[PDB]
Amino acid sequence: PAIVGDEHYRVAQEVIRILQRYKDLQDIIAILGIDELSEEDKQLVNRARRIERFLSQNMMAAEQFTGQPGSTVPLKETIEAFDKLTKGEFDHLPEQAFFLIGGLDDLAKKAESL
Amino acid sequence: PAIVGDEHYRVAQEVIRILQRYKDLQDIIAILGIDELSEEDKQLVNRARRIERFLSQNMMAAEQFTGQPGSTVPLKETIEAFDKLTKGEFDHLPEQAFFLIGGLDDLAKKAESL
Amino acid sequence: PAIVGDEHYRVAQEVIRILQRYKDLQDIIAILGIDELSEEDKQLVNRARRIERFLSQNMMAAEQFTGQPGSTVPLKETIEAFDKLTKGEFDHLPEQAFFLIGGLDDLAKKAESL
Amino acid sequence: TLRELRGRIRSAGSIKKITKAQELIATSRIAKAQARVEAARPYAAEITNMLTELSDRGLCGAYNANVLRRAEELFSLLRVGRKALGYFSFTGFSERPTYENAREIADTLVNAFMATEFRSMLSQTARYIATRVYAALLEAAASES
Amino acid sequence: DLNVEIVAVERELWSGPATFVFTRTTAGEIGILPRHIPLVAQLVDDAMVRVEREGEDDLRIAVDGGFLSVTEETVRILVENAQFESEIDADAAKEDAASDDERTAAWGRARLR
Amino acid sequence: SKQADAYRAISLLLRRPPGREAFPGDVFYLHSRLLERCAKLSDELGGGSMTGLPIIETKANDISAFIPTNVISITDGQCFLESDLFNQGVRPAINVGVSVSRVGGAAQIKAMKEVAGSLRLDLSQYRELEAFAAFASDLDAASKAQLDRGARLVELLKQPQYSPLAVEEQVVAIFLGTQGHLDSVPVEDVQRFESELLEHVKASHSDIFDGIRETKKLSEEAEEKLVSVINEFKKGFXXXXXXXXXXX
Structure with a gap:
């Protein structure tokens, strides 16, 4: 909290909490699935999966690999994005919308096409 | 049965049988739970858990650790106690009643407080 | 298909397909039976059982065991036999006719006696 | 460490048989469900001729999820079972239910007024009133298994 | 003759061609024989008799339900809870006459005996 | 198991090169000569017998271990005892599936x-x-x-x-x-x-x-x-x- 401020630290740890719980439930999800989990857990798993896919990003060096050009996301955009994801403002959007995107505008733009 | 008599041997093995079956079902209970087990198994698991917690006992040396003074349980008290547990005479009592107790009187005394 | 021709390969795999499906339905047949299976499956099970019993053969070494002398079946006889079984030309014949026989002539000869 | 891995093999190995068992137990209950519907259908047919002349257990995939989804959507647009009652809040119906089970609830529903479709094993889509309640219950019991 | 279908809500019992059938209804004691007018009638808590070409006429219970008849030679009987004498015995109906709702079902089972 | 451990000690003290599980090369050969001497002689040599009941102490029901596998491959069948079965009440705790008799019906x-x-x-x-x-x-x-x-x-x-x-x-x-x-x-x-x-x-x-x-x-x-x-x-x-x- 000293260097990178309280907000960044709060969001960073909150993201880790969600991803940690998701990893713990992997064993149960492997056999049974999402159905046997509780209402709260169901939502956490949904958010966790979307967070995992949002962490993916286009690389400037990887034009030959992917095809699309890379994207650079400022700190303010990053903090705000994961803030909205943790609160659950983008629960309506599909999983494919989060895959391989930089800014929040590109999420909404790809959401319409799908 | 030669040294310690038939009763002691019978109770000792019967306790081991219950705890063994409980350990076998740990893998199934971890995923599915208690719901999928049969009426008989449900009761065995309940008894097994209560037997595990009754085996716990206050130690005279461990006054600094626990807080409460230790308790010494004669052979006759021991045999009679596990006899009643296996038969299922203390099915009504809670799990916390069995935790860290010596005699049968102390079980019933703590049961009322809870 | 390169080393042994296309026909042999076709018949070999087709026999395996029938026996595989039969093995899959063992679990369902164990509880429910033949009744719940469809008209197609009923016939496949009938053929599968007959194929299993046709694969049995008299051994020259096993005169003391069985009683009857052994039989040697050429490649051409083998291919033609399983060809007719897969097509379902010997659907009328009983299950006992296929048990412990070499050539196709011996099948028909034993069929009359029963 | 082997100790951990050996225990996991034992765990998964045991669970496999449990899942495989409940798979084939559900395969039995579908046959009895359909057989019960075969008896119910011609009865309701004979009742309609006159009137014209005049889940508890889990481990059922997305059975409850699909039904509750359609329910929530229909209620929002326009305006029985422990699992369902639990969802709505935030029973003890047999696997092969008889009429005595759905007699009392049917009567009370009829008195109030006075005063999952089975397709395949994989595919399930979510006086006279008493028979309608029951006719649904069997089809629901089938869809569950 | 008419094809008399005794059906219960749980399962179909019988569908044999009987010569005639007798039972008590809310209106009266009706006797449905061949070439009868299309009629609708509710049944009361009482027994009924089914008479087949050969053999003795069996008698059966009907607590609730009705009775069907049409222009076509097809009699049908719908009962909520039917019982055939065979090996019932018990005579619980008499002891279950205390309760009024159970006396209803009892009165049906009692008259058959 | 203990006799094998004893020979391992001797070999290591004599500075013989160790192999799998720190055992010498002829640890299999040790058990081989011993067990083979147990046999059923011909009618010409009297027709006497000498039955063997060797024992091996497994660790966490590890049949795959070196010394067990050695003796298993020598003997004419095995009677695998289990801890889980023993504790559950099955005594003797012979696992039916794994245990085998190579002679079989001939010795019945x-x-x-x-x-x-x-x-x-x-x-x-x-x-x-x-x-x-x-x-x-x-x-x-x-x-x-x-x-x-x-x-x-x-x-x-x-x-x-x-x-x-x-x-x-x-x-x-x-x-x-x-x-x-x-x-x-x-x-x-x-x-x-x-x-x-x-x-x-x-x-x-x-x-x-x-x-x-x-x-x-x-x-x-x-x-x-x-x-x-x-x-x-x-x-x-x-x-x-x-x-x-x-x-x-």
């Missing part, structure tokens, strides 16, 4: 060969079914009967310590279970039923035991005799748990 009298010919098959089916047993009355009839039979067969195989039974007593006990004479009796009362039955046959019907000893087979007369003896005993037998049941 005709009486035992007939009765315990398809005992192994029934129990192999039981273990396969066993999973379904918990879910009572959700199955058909055939599988239910196999589970009820199998469960009772397990109780017969259970045996108390320091109590060897004669061969004629064993065949009768197995014949009882396999034919389905214990199906009426509860599972928990099978052990006491067996004990009291043998006492009765020992006293009254010694001729049946004597017949098996001499002939080394169970006669059709003896079969019908046993059936009547069992039925009569069932009536007398007071069931410990709940009400009694003879036949249906």
Whole structure:
């Protein structure tokens, strides 16, 4: 909290909490699935999966690999994005919308096409 | 049965049988739970858990650790106690009643407080 | 298909397909039976059982065991036999006719006696 | 460490048989469900001729999820079972239910007024009133298994 | 003759061609024989008799339900809870006459005996 | 296991190069020469015998270990004991699936060969079914009967310590279970039923035991005799748990 401020630290740890719980439930999800989990857990798993896919990003060096050009996301955009994801403002959007995107505008733009 | 008599041997093995079956079902209970087990198994698991917690006992040396003074349980008290547990005479009592107790009187005394 | 021709390969795999499906339905047949299976499956099970019993053969070494002398079946006889079984030309014949026989002539000869 | 891995093999190995068992137990209950519907259908047919002349257990995939989804959507647009009652809040119906089970609830529903479709094993889509309640219950019991 | 279908809500019992059938209804004691007018009638808590070409006429219970008849030679009987004498015995109906709702079902089972 | 460990110590002190699990090369050869000397001689050399019962101490039921695998490959079958089975109440705790006899029926009298010919098959089916047993009355009839039979067969195989039974007593006990004479009796009362039955046959019907000893087979007369003896005993037998049941 000293260097990178309280907000960044709060969001960073909150993201880790969600991803940690998701990893713990992997064993149960492997056999049974999402159905046997509780209402709260169901939502956490949904958010966790979307967070995992949002962490993916286009690389400037990887034009030959992917095809699309890379994207650079400022700190303010990053903090705000994961803030909205943790609160659950983008629960309506599909999983494919989060895959391989930089800014929040590109999420909404790809959401319409799908 | 030669040294310690038939009763002691019978109770000792019967306790081991219950705890063994409980350990076998740990893998199934971890995923599915208690719901999928049969009426008989449900009761065995309940008894097994209560037997595990009754085996716990206050130690005279461990006054600094626990807080409460230790308790010494004669052979006759021991045999009679596990006899009643296996038969299922203390099915009504809670799990916390069995935790860290010596005699049968102390079980019933703590049961009322809870 | 390169080393042994296309026909042999076709018949070999087709026999395996029938026996595989039969093995899959063992679990369902164990509880429910033949009744719940469809008209197609009923016939496949009938053929599968007959194929299993046709694969049995008299051994020259096993005169003391069985009683009857052994039989040697050429490649051409083998291919033609399983060809007719897969097509379902010997659907009328009983299950006992296929048990412990070499050539196709011996099948028909034993069929009359029963 | 082997100790951990050996225990996991034992765990998964045991669970496999449990899942495989409940798979084939559900395969039995579908046959009895359909057989019960075969008896119910011609009865309701004979009742309609006159009137014209005049889940508890889990481990059922997305059975409850699909039904509750359609329910929530229909209620929002326009305006029985422990699992369902639990969802709505935030029973003890047999696997092969008889009429005595759905007699009392049917009567009370009829008195109030006075005063999952089975397709395949994989595919399930979510006086006279008493028979309608029951006719649904069997089809629901089938869809569950 | 008419094809008399005794059906219960749980399962179909019988569908044999009987010569005639007798039972008590809310209106009266009706006797449905061949070439009868299309009629609708509710049944009361009482027994009924089914008479087949050969053999003795069996008698059966009907607590609730009705009775069907049409222009076509097809009699049908719908009962909520039917019982055939065979090996019932018990005579619980008499002891279950205390309760009024159970006396209803009892009165049906009692008259058959 | 300890003799192997002893030789390992000697070899390492003599500065012989170690191999797998710090054992010398000729640790297999050590056990080989020892066990092979156990044999059945020809008629020309008298026809004497020398049976061997070697023991190996596994660690966490590790059959795959070096020394176990060595001795397993030498001996003529193995009797694998399990901890889980022992604690669960199955004593002796012989795992049926893993344990084998390489000689087999050759080392059995005709009486035992007939009765315990398809005992192994029934129990192999039981273990396969066993999973379904918990879910009572959700199955058909055939599988239910196999589970009820199998469960009772397990109780017969259970045996108390320091109590060897004669061969004629064993065949009768197995014949009882396999034919389905214990199906009426509860599972928990099978052990006491067996004990009291043998006492009765020992006293009254010694001729049946004597017949098996001499002939080394169970006669059709003896079969019908046993059936009547069992039925009569069932009536007398007071069931410990709940009400009694003879036949249906």
